[PDB]
Amino acid sequence: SKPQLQRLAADADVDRMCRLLEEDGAFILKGLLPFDVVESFNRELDVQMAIPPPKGERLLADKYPPHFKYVPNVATTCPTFRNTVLINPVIHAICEAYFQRTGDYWLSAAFLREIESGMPAQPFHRDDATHPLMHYQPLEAPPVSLSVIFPLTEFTEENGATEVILGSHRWTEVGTPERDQAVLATMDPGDVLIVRQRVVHAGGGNRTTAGKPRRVVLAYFNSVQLTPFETYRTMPREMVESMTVLGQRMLGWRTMKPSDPNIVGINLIDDKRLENVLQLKAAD
Amino acid sequence: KPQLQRLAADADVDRMCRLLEEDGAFILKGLLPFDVVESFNRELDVQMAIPPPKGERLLADKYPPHFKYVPNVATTCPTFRNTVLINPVIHAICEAYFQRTGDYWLSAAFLREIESGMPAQPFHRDDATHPLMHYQPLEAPPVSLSVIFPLTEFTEENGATEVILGSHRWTEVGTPERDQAVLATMDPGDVLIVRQRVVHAGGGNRTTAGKPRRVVLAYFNSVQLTPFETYRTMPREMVESMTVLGQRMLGWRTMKPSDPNIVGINLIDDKRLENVLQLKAADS
Ligand SMILES: COc1ccc2c3c(n(CC=C(C)C)c2c1)[C@H](C=C(C)C)N1C(=O)[C@@H]2CCCN2C(=O)[C@]1(O)[C@H]3O
Ligand SMILES: COc1ccc2c3c(n(CC=C(C)C)c2c1)[C@H](C=C(C)C)N1C(=O)[C@@H]2CCCN2C(=O)[C@]1(O)[C@H]3O
Ligand SMILES: O=C(O)CCC(=O)C(=O)O
Ligand SMILES: O=C(O)CCC(=O)C(=O)O
Ligand SMILES: [Fe+2]
Ligand SMILES: [Fe+2]
Ligand SMILES: [Fe+2]
Ligand SMILES: [Fe+2]
């Protein structure tokens, strides 16, 4: 069939990863997270899936059909995400290389979707739609967003493995593509799918019959020039201070630095660093 | 040589918009009443009497001592927070200008005070806070607007803001000569509005009489862009003393970029930030 997503081992060099992002728009890393990390993350998500459901307004969940179960802002309820996944050194090597031209990056959102048996596919989209200015950024400009997609169960053809349209970052418009234009990110738990800015993709339908839910966590990174979709500003101080410096930087708790010509920074207060005004301690 | 156009405070916003598109800037005459200018100046006097810290100053430490700098004006100046920041003409302009991008908020508000003997500021675009703006096409929805308040007279001799008309049509700032600019000579109560991508600079103060020149920048950005200054450490008591509009400007509420983002930005728990915080407001 069509050209497929390229798979690389977790120890591959970041240069080939970048080449794949520019050429295909996406690639898969095999075996990045160990089994115990996946297990611990799933255990923490199980708790969030089991507490009483939210009542009142749900800004995203109320608007879209009930074709997924949603745990927003997993960093606030899943220590394995904050302490291990969010600070993974390979993910940050990729981010540092990819965001080199734009400067610092941070976490715009990270959430779980759980797709039960019988749910149809998600509409094709670009994650870029969070910040519509990205639609007008030329392809050659410094990228400002990156999607990091973690399978927490197997992703199969039957259960709706993420569908990615390779090369669709070269399109001006998303349009209305057919599902057969995409290829499948079939993966095992512990793998990761990395998707460039402007690449059209979607969760697939779960065609299993009963009781076989697919779990996916998206960690959406943006240039610090872009406002985080999720604000981590209500995290308690003791939780923030239990993170490493890198974790605090990702979650918006520190002053950050866009590329030159901004030599001053962003997310400042009183001409000082946010973490200094707050006297933030950190685990490291 | 074409000069900045001056308009009365009751001019139609459509004329203001035409001037921003053609010239890149215009002046409104007599927007703020005498008592508002006076109280704002007295509030800034309080801050100007505080000696600067000898700790880190992220902006002030990097540039020559050719200005005195008071950041965080929305916190320390109630006349700004309660009156200037919510001015209906300013918001009518912002609503027209930011129509295509969606919601906007306050990225920074600061004072510069320039005493006799200080030379001119380098030419710049305020856009340099968020370098992605350099790559945005001229016809794309604007994402930044500079609102410049004279708190003293601005004259040729005291260093009235210099604006290069039409420079938003240049790709690069380049190295323009001072004589390419025209002067925003103004009296307190006026305002200078400067479009995204327009090259401008404060002038030198060559006088030997009169108060040091005072200028306040209120820098507005699309909510897609991270505020240069964060107001997240403002005490809840002070936040709740503001109107809803003021809270929205200072980053304390969930906001709405344009379609195709139908969910929002600056949210948490899939809910509006102000609902999670149970924020009261002066006009709620
Ligand atoms: C959490 O599960 C979902 C369930 C549905 C959607 C949809 C989109 N996203 C991504 C959201 C992020 C915060 C990364 C979704 C995430 C996504 C929306 C955004 C803000 C990126 N979207 C779209 O962009 C396009 C825009 C036109 C219709 N679209 C959709 O229906 C849709 O796929 C919609 O189903
Ligand atoms: C508050 O007083 C100052 C004193 C100096 C500068 C300079 C710039 N700005 C604007 C800052 C904002 C937060 C709106 C300044 C503001 C401005 C910097 C930024 C981040 C917009 N700048 C520049 O962009 C260019 C970039 C190249 C050299 N430049 C300068 O020296 C300079 O004018 C520099 O003097
Ligand atoms: O469900 C998936 O595999 C992809 C989800 C996704 O792309 C999203 O929610 O932004
Ligand atoms: O000093 C002035 O009149 C202009 C100041 C300015 O443009 C800035 O600091 O961004
Ligand atoms: Fe997505
Ligand atoms: Fe098949
Ligand atoms: Fe400026
Ligand atoms: Fe003179």
XYZ file of C-alpha atoms and ligand atoms in Angstrom:
662
model
C 0.000 0.000 0.000
C 1.010 3.608 0.675
C 4.249 4.788 2.310
C 3.956 4.088 6.026
C 5.071 5.915 9.134
C 8.742 5.270 9.762
C 9.634 3.575 13.043
C 12.889 4.230 14.906
C 14.305 2.770 18.093
C 14.193 4.927 21.207
C 17.981 5.436 21.012
C 18.047 6.764 17.428
C 19.691 10.133 16.771
C 17.533 13.236 16.735
C 18.811 14.271 13.276
C 16.946 11.458 11.521
C 13.856 12.242 13.602
C 13.969 15.841 12.356
C 14.395 14.717 8.758
C 11.307 12.543 9.083
C 9.289 15.409 10.572
C 10.216 17.663 7.670
C 9.662 14.994 5.005
C 6.752 12.884 6.270
C 5.438 15.063 9.103
C 5.544 12.290 11.707
C 7.407 9.219 12.952
C 7.170 6.556 15.664
C 9.689 5.776 18.402
C 9.693 2.189 19.647
C 10.033 1.273 23.300
C 10.627 4.676 24.839
C 8.716 4.221 28.085
C 9.352 1.109 30.200
C 6.500 -1.218 31.084
C 6.398 -0.095 34.718
C 6.068 3.581 33.750
C 3.146 2.803 31.427
C 1.578 0.696 34.180
C 1.920 3.403 36.836
C 0.512 6.069 34.511
C -2.452 3.830 33.659
C -3.074 3.209 37.388
C -3.248 6.950 38.040
C -5.551 7.450 35.055
C -7.795 4.616 36.298
C -8.424 6.681 39.431
C -9.438 9.687 37.331
C -11.718 7.500 35.189
C -13.392 6.128 38.355
C -14.180 9.277 40.372
C -17.671 10.793 39.872
C -17.929 12.401 36.420
C -17.783 16.191 36.078
C -21.030 18.096 36.465
C -21.675 21.459 34.885
C -19.847 22.968 31.955
C -17.235 20.917 30.087
C -15.736 23.247 27.491
C -14.489 20.566 25.109
C -16.498 17.505 26.137
C -19.907 19.231 25.926
C -19.331 20.343 22.343
C -18.262 17.110 20.658
C -20.143 13.798 20.436
C -19.580 11.275 23.272
C -17.105 9.250 21.215
C -14.270 9.394 23.745
C -13.830 9.651 27.494
C -11.698 12.633 28.472
C -9.314 13.298 31.347
C -7.977 16.832 30.874
C -4.721 18.228 32.237
C -3.303 14.893 33.407
C -0.263 16.668 34.873
C -2.446 17.783 37.806
C -3.586 14.254 38.795
C -0.903 11.857 37.477
C 2.466 11.999 39.274
C 4.007 9.557 36.779
C 3.314 12.107 34.058
C 4.830 15.024 36.018
C 7.825 13.160 37.385
C 8.731 10.814 34.532
C 6.903 11.172 31.216
C 6.931 14.979 31.039
C 10.700 15.151 31.621
C 11.714 12.223 29.409
C 15.195 12.986 28.000
C 14.494 11.705 24.475
C 11.328 13.800 24.198
C 13.334 16.844 25.276
C 16.170 16.093 22.857
C 13.563 16.096 20.057
C 11.962 19.281 21.367
C 15.301 21.086 21.694
C 16.247 20.235 18.105
C 12.788 20.960 16.670
C 12.228 24.218 18.572
C 15.826 25.475 18.199
C 14.807 28.276 15.833
C 11.811 29.486 17.897
C 13.472 29.305 21.328
C 11.955 27.884 24.518
C 8.937 25.570 24.479
C 6.464 24.443 27.141
C 3.477 22.165 27.654
C 0.297 23.605 26.148
C -1.875 20.628 27.123
C -1.706 16.992 28.061
C -4.815 14.834 28.267
C -6.170 11.308 28.011
C -8.714 10.037 25.536
C -10.175 6.596 26.214
C -12.109 5.153 23.269
C -14.459 2.315 24.135
C -15.609 -0.430 21.791
C -18.091 0.854 19.229
C -17.055 4.508 19.149
C -16.541 5.950 15.658
C -13.464 7.822 14.503
C -12.467 11.341 15.484
C -12.657 14.043 12.776
C -9.414 14.817 10.958
C -7.744 17.933 12.320
C -4.534 19.790 12.978
C -3.708 20.365 16.626
C -2.684 23.835 15.325
C -6.356 24.852 15.491
C -5.840 25.701 19.192
C -3.962 28.810 17.980
C -5.413 29.882 14.595
C -2.466 32.207 13.879
C -0.518 29.044 12.995
C -2.634 28.700 9.850
C -0.910 31.805 8.465
C 2.655 30.850 9.444
C 4.686 29.817 6.362
C 5.918 26.230 6.303
C 9.560 27.352 6.420
C 9.126 29.569 9.498
C 10.381 28.309 12.889
C 7.858 25.717 14.090
C 5.843 26.656 17.162
C 3.962 23.441 17.987
C 4.630 19.696 18.266
C 2.334 16.804 19.195
C 3.643 13.862 21.228
C 1.163 10.982 21.250
C 1.571 8.163 23.811
C -0.291 4.863 23.335
C -1.243 3.523 26.755
C -2.816 0.425 25.213
C -1.990 -1.329 21.985
C -2.993 0.627 18.871
C -4.325 -1.731 16.186
C -6.203 -1.470 12.906
C -9.261 -2.898 14.676
C -9.200 -0.607 17.713
C -8.566 2.711 15.931
C -4.819 3.420 15.886
C -4.143 7.100 15.193
C -4.455 7.940 11.499
C -1.861 10.337 10.054
C -1.841 11.855 6.559
C 1.847 11.986 5.637
C 2.945 15.183 3.914
C -0.234 17.058 4.866
C 1.854 19.791 6.509
C 2.527 20.938 2.932
C -1.198 21.636 2.415
C -2.588 25.101 3.011
C -6.011 23.755 4.020
C -7.107 20.655 5.911
C -9.948 20.172 3.461
C -12.135 17.071 3.742
C -9.746 14.146 3.231
C -10.855 10.527 3.054
C -9.690 8.095 5.720
C -7.804 6.088 3.062
C -5.403 9.030 2.622
C -4.034 8.302 6.110
C -1.761 5.552 7.383
C -2.035 3.939 10.803
C 0.212 4.463 13.821
C -0.050 0.878 15.000
C 2.019 0.748 18.190
C 2.548 -1.035 21.497
C 2.328 0.676 24.913
C 5.607 2.450 25.566
C 6.015 3.624 21.962
C 5.401 7.244 20.951
C 4.036 8.927 17.826
C 5.517 12.370 17.092
C 3.495 14.664 14.807
C 4.799 17.927 13.306
C 2.886 21.199 13.289
C 0.305 21.353 10.480
C -0.013 17.553 10.011
C -3.599 16.292 9.620
C -4.433 13.307 11.825
C -7.246 11.728 13.848
C -8.085 8.968 16.259
C -9.720 6.009 14.558
C -12.925 4.160 15.312
C -12.792 1.345 17.845
C -14.295 -1.575 15.938
C -13.737 -4.133 18.697
C -17.010 -5.539 19.974
C -16.960 -5.001 23.737
C -14.638 -4.127 26.588
C -11.436 -3.345 24.663
C -10.829 0.407 25.125
C -7.970 2.237 23.451
C -6.076 4.790 25.561
C -4.038 7.677 24.170
C -2.350 10.606 25.915
C -1.480 13.683 23.881
C 1.295 15.911 25.192
C 1.056 19.082 23.102
C 4.147 21.294 23.206
C 4.227 24.885 21.982
C 6.707 27.709 21.741
C 6.547 29.788 24.922
C 5.324 32.568 22.626
C 1.973 30.722 22.569
C -0.477 30.769 25.461
C -0.968 27.315 26.998
C -4.354 25.807 26.214
C -4.365 24.378 29.766
C -3.209 26.668 32.592
C -1.364 24.892 35.427
C -1.468 28.021 37.619
C -3.806 26.511 40.221
C -1.455 23.659 41.146
C -0.589 23.813 44.865
C 2.863 25.105 45.734
C 3.946 21.821 47.290
C 3.117 20.004 44.054
C 4.992 22.568 41.939
C 8.039 22.453 44.230
C 8.111 18.634 44.015
C 8.828 18.908 40.283
C 12.234 19.372 38.729
C 13.177 22.722 37.209
C 12.425 21.278 33.760
C 8.967 20.181 34.886
C 8.213 23.612 36.345
C 9.362 25.250 33.106
C 7.059 22.985 31.099
C 4.047 23.796 33.291
C 4.283 27.600 33.054
C 5.731 28.248 36.530
C 8.966 29.894 35.320
C 10.045 32.795 33.150
C 10.992 31.556 29.671
C 12.907 32.798 26.628
C 11.699 33.071 23.023
C 14.374 33.315 20.361
C 16.191 36.489 19.577
C 15.333 39.287 18.956
C 13.566 38.947 22.322
C 16.630 39.088 24.597
C 14.537 39.729 27.733
C 12.102 36.830 28.036
C 8.401 36.146 28.459
C 6.189 35.324 31.459
C 8.012 37.874 33.690
C 6.766 39.821 36.703
C 8.074 43.150 38.034
C 11.083 42.829 35.677
C 12.014 39.633 37.535
C 11.757 35.909 36.961
C 8.451 34.401 38.061
C 10.228 31.661 40.019
C 12.235 34.293 41.881
C 9.184 36.385 42.787
C 7.549 33.161 44.019
C 10.768 31.860 45.662
C 10.088 28.489 44.083
C 12.044 25.503 45.275
C 12.520 22.538 42.941
C 13.364 18.856 43.356
C 16.718 19.350 41.612
C 6.275 64.983 4.680
C 3.123 63.104 5.723
C 2.408 63.424 9.441
C 0.533 61.293 11.933
C -3.181 61.999 11.648
C -4.852 63.358 14.786
C -8.491 62.444 15.480
C -10.906 63.545 18.176
C -11.953 61.058 20.848
C -15.403 60.722 19.219
C -14.132 59.896 15.718
C -15.524 56.758 14.099
C -13.435 53.628 14.581
C -13.643 52.859 10.862
C -11.488 55.936 10.193
C -9.026 54.791 12.873
C -8.816 51.385 11.195
C -8.157 52.935 7.791
C -5.306 54.970 9.282
C -3.794 51.874 10.917
C -3.863 50.028 7.605
C -2.458 52.919 5.563
C -0.086 54.776 7.891
C 0.325 52.208 10.673
C -0.515 54.665 13.451
C -2.680 57.611 14.461
C -3.271 59.865 17.470
C -6.474 60.332 19.476
C -6.816 63.755 21.090
C -8.209 64.306 24.565
C -9.271 60.762 25.378
C -8.382 60.792 29.086
C -9.669 63.609 31.329
C -7.385 65.777 33.435
C -8.269 64.040 36.704
C -7.419 60.596 35.304
C -4.038 61.751 33.994
C -3.335 63.449 37.322
C -4.196 60.448 39.496
C -2.242 58.097 37.204
C 0.803 60.366 37.499
C 0.509 60.463 41.306
C 0.343 56.656 41.421
C 3.433 56.439 39.228
C 5.168 58.987 41.470
C 4.835 56.479 44.320
C 6.636 53.839 42.254
C 9.237 56.278 40.886
C 10.253 57.198 44.444
C 11.123 53.540 45.124
C 14.809 52.926 44.333
C 15.441 50.219 41.733
C 16.522 46.827 43.075
C 20.130 45.740 42.754
C 18.988 42.201 42.088
C 18.189 41.044 38.586
C 16.210 43.368 36.305
C 15.499 41.381 33.158
C 14.860 44.331 30.822
C 16.552 47.229 32.630
C 19.868 45.407 33.161
C 20.270 44.698 29.455
C 19.876 48.218 28.054
C 21.740 51.473 28.768
C 20.446 53.737 31.582
C 18.612 55.961 29.108
C 15.170 55.648 30.743
C 13.662 54.869 34.118
C 11.370 51.841 34.002
C 8.276 50.947 36.036
C 6.772 47.584 35.012
C 3.632 46.022 36.483
C 1.563 49.228 36.174
C -1.742 47.340 36.270
C -0.891 46.219 39.813
C 0.573 49.415 41.224
C -1.643 52.031 39.512
C -5.368 51.717 40.337
C -6.213 54.456 37.827
C -4.736 52.260 35.100
C -6.395 49.057 36.326
C -9.826 50.562 37.081
C -10.130 53.262 34.394
C -7.536 53.379 31.605
C -7.412 49.610 31.013
C -11.194 49.464 30.489
C -11.571 52.657 28.446
C -14.471 52.165 25.984
C -12.761 53.853 23.014
C -9.615 51.747 23.459
C -11.799 48.633 23.515
C -13.817 49.728 20.490
C -10.495 50.027 18.631
C -9.277 46.663 19.927
C -12.550 44.930 19.043
C -12.339 46.186 15.455
C -8.602 45.580 15.089
C -8.565 42.092 16.662
C -11.845 41.015 15.018
C -10.162 38.432 12.788
C -7.934 36.915 15.504
C -10.531 36.759 18.283
C -10.011 37.722 21.903
C -7.157 39.936 23.044
C -5.588 40.703 26.426
C -2.916 42.844 28.037
C 0.612 41.642 27.346
C 2.396 44.425 29.250
C 1.818 47.837 30.760
C 4.806 49.899 31.805
C 6.121 53.420 32.279
C 9.269 54.907 30.821
C 10.466 58.202 32.282
C 13.140 59.998 30.232
C 15.054 62.849 31.848
C 17.096 65.610 30.235
C 20.383 64.327 28.849
C 19.139 60.868 27.913
C 19.501 59.990 24.208
C 16.928 58.369 21.937
C 15.766 54.749 22.108
C 16.713 52.426 19.221
C 14.112 51.909 16.513
C 12.164 48.700 16.973
C 8.934 46.837 16.477
C 7.133 45.850 19.656
C 6.553 42.591 17.715
C 10.032 41.452 18.785
C 8.497 40.200 22.060
C 7.077 37.279 20.031
C 9.441 36.582 17.101
C 6.840 34.437 15.308
C 5.197 37.739 14.309
C 8.074 38.394 11.924
C 6.864 35.477 9.796
C 3.162 36.385 9.823
C 2.060 37.700 6.396
C 0.935 41.319 6.319
C -2.592 40.276 5.356
C -2.988 37.774 8.228
C -5.177 38.640 11.254
C -3.197 41.072 13.422
C -2.123 39.736 16.812
C -0.577 42.787 18.526
C -1.365 46.477 19.053
C 0.560 49.173 20.931
C -1.369 51.839 22.861
C 0.959 54.634 23.942
C -0.163 57.192 26.552
C 1.731 60.476 27.038
C 1.651 61.411 30.720
C 3.579 64.620 30.031
C 3.646 66.677 26.882
C 5.603 65.104 24.029
C 7.625 67.678 22.069
C 10.427 67.592 19.533
C 12.890 68.740 22.182
C 11.828 66.294 24.915
C 11.754 63.225 22.655
C 8.207 62.641 21.376
C 7.757 59.109 20.055
C 9.058 58.765 16.502
C 7.021 56.614 14.108
C 7.973 55.521 10.588
C 4.695 55.619 8.664
C 4.133 52.676 6.363
C 6.930 50.603 7.911
C 4.509 47.753 8.600
C 4.863 47.032 4.875
C 8.595 46.336 5.278
C 9.767 42.780 5.794
C 12.809 43.878 7.832
C 13.333 46.739 10.267
C 16.674 47.474 8.631
C 18.674 50.487 9.805
C 16.464 53.498 9.063
C 17.640 57.044 9.641
C 15.857 59.124 12.271
C 14.589 61.517 9.585
C 12.436 58.722 8.135
C 10.196 59.053 11.201
C 7.605 61.657 12.127
C 6.877 62.847 15.663
C 3.899 62.003 17.870
C 3.816 65.402 19.525
C 0.942 65.207 22.011
C -0.430 66.491 25.297
C -1.410 64.412 28.343
C -4.798 62.865 27.705
C -3.965 61.987 24.104
C -3.060 58.480 22.927
C -0.860 57.172 20.117
C -2.030 53.883 18.550
C 0.645 51.879 16.702
C -0.171 48.842 14.527
C 1.734 45.564 14.584
C 5.002 45.684 12.584
C 5.374 49.508 12.712
C 8.899 50.740 13.444
C 9.072 53.393 16.164
C 11.190 54.676 19.058
C 11.293 57.135 21.911
C 13.410 60.202 21.280
C 16.140 61.889 23.271
C 15.371 64.528 25.891
C 17.409 67.630 25.044
C 15.484 70.106 27.194
C 16.910 71.952 30.187
C 13.501 72.728 31.738
C 10.300 70.798 32.340
C 9.387 67.460 33.879
C 11.028 64.313 32.475
C 9.019 62.874 29.601
C 6.617 60.137 30.735
C 5.181 57.468 28.453
C 3.035 54.449 29.333
C 2.793 51.548 26.895
C -0.250 49.310 27.109
C 0.677 46.414 24.816
C -2.284 44.285 23.731
C -1.939 40.869 22.107
C -4.216 38.157 20.826
C -4.923 35.710 23.654
C -3.054 33.193 21.509
C 0.153 34.988 22.560
C 1.699 34.562 26.010
C 1.699 37.813 28.026
C 5.141 39.365 28.356
C 4.199 40.236 31.967
C 2.073 37.872 34.044
C -0.527 39.213 36.474
C -1.019 35.774 38.045
C 0.475 36.890 41.383
C -2.020 39.721 41.877
C -3.825 39.111 45.200
C -7.290 37.599 44.817
C -8.695 40.581 46.711
C -7.328 42.910 44.035
C -8.464 40.683 41.140
C -12.008 40.559 42.501
C -12.111 44.360 42.829
C -11.789 44.611 39.030
C -14.569 44.373 36.483
C -14.955 41.280 34.320
C -13.303 43.139 31.439
C -10.298 43.994 33.601
C -9.968 40.388 34.778
C -10.125 39.232 31.161
C -7.376 41.680 30.188
C -5.118 40.532 33.025
C -5.242 36.804 32.251
C -7.575 35.697 35.073
C -10.298 34.295 32.777
C -10.643 31.729 30.034
C -10.554 33.443 26.618
C -11.579 32.656 23.043
C -9.315 32.696 19.973
C -11.079 32.791 16.624
C -12.619 29.836 14.894
C -11.646 27.075 14.336
C -10.905 26.966 18.098
C -14.441 26.626 19.505
C -13.245 25.539 22.968
C -11.087 28.372 24.290
C -7.659 28.970 25.773
C -6.362 29.457 29.320
C -8.709 26.831 30.789
C -8.297 24.062 33.375
C -10.262 20.942 34.335
C -12.134 21.428 31.020
C -13.705 24.454 32.721
C -13.374 28.220 32.683
C -10.542 29.425 34.900
C -12.803 31.932 36.651
C -15.268 29.148 37.460
C -12.557 26.873 38.894
C -11.345 29.827 40.984
C -14.913 30.955 41.820
C -13.850 34.500 40.967
C -16.068 37.389 41.955
C -15.939 40.651 40.015
C -16.937 44.236 40.751
C -19.650 44.147 38.071
C -20.843 40.578 38.666
C -9.939 15.226 23.657
O -10.556 14.622 22.543
C -10.840 15.361 21.452
C -12.101 15.228 20.819
C -12.419 15.955 19.700
C -11.514 16.876 19.144
C -11.512 17.777 18.032
C -10.270 18.377 17.989
N -9.501 17.935 19.075
C -8.124 18.351 19.417
C -8.034 19.237 20.592
C -6.903 19.677 21.160
C -6.936 20.588 22.367
C -5.517 19.285 20.632
C -10.251 16.997 19.782
C -9.909 16.255 20.928
C -9.848 19.462 17.115
C -9.838 20.793 17.889
C -8.824 21.584 18.263
C -9.050 22.822 19.116
C -7.410 21.316 17.815
N -10.738 19.537 15.910
C -10.398 20.459 14.908
O -9.450 21.187 14.986
C -11.269 20.506 13.634
C -11.612 21.949 13.221
C -12.824 21.689 12.309
C -13.624 20.525 12.960
N -12.560 19.934 13.847
C -12.966 18.982 14.822
O -14.121 18.582 14.891
C -11.819 18.492 15.697
O -11.215 17.411 15.042
C -12.548 18.065 17.011
O -13.276 16.914 16.660
C 10.869 50.008 28.542
O 11.987 50.615 27.930
C 12.576 50.028 26.856
C 13.964 50.216 26.619
C 14.579 49.622 25.540
C 13.874 48.811 24.630
C 14.189 48.065 23.450
C 13.018 47.501 22.984
N 11.976 47.815 23.875
C 10.568 47.392 23.772
C 10.156 46.365 24.767
C 8.912 45.918 24.950
C 8.613 44.868 25.983
C 7.739 46.438 24.127
C 12.487 48.626 24.878
C 11.832 49.224 25.974
C 12.889 46.543 21.896
C 12.708 45.126 22.455
C 11.645 44.301 22.424
C 11.658 42.950 23.120
C 10.391 44.642 21.674
N 14.098 46.606 21.005
C 14.084 45.814 19.859
O 13.183 45.080 19.572
C 15.282 45.912 18.900
C 15.733 44.535 18.398
C 17.166 44.874 17.947
C 17.732 45.919 18.961
N 16.451 46.420 19.559
C 16.538 47.234 20.706
O 17.621 47.589 21.169
C 15.174 47.637 21.239
O 14.782 48.786 20.561
C 15.476 47.894 22.743
O 16.232 49.077 22.748
O -7.182 9.551 19.456
C -6.066 9.666 18.898
O -5.323 8.690 18.659
C -5.570 11.032 18.474
C -6.214 12.115 19.336
C -5.913 13.499 18.807
O -5.317 13.645 17.752
C -6.352 14.672 19.561
O -7.248 14.535 20.417
O -5.846 15.793 19.346
O 9.557 56.142 24.691
C 8.667 56.114 23.803
O 8.047 57.142 23.448
C 8.332 54.809 23.114
C 8.659 53.620 24.012
C 8.525 52.312 23.268
O 8.258 52.332 22.087
C 8.757 51.047 23.958
O 9.408 51.077 25.017
O 8.347 49.973 23.479
Fe -4.798 15.778 17.496
Fe -8.339 -4.809 7.319
Fe 7.877 50.261 21.391
Fe 13.841 73.500 19.353
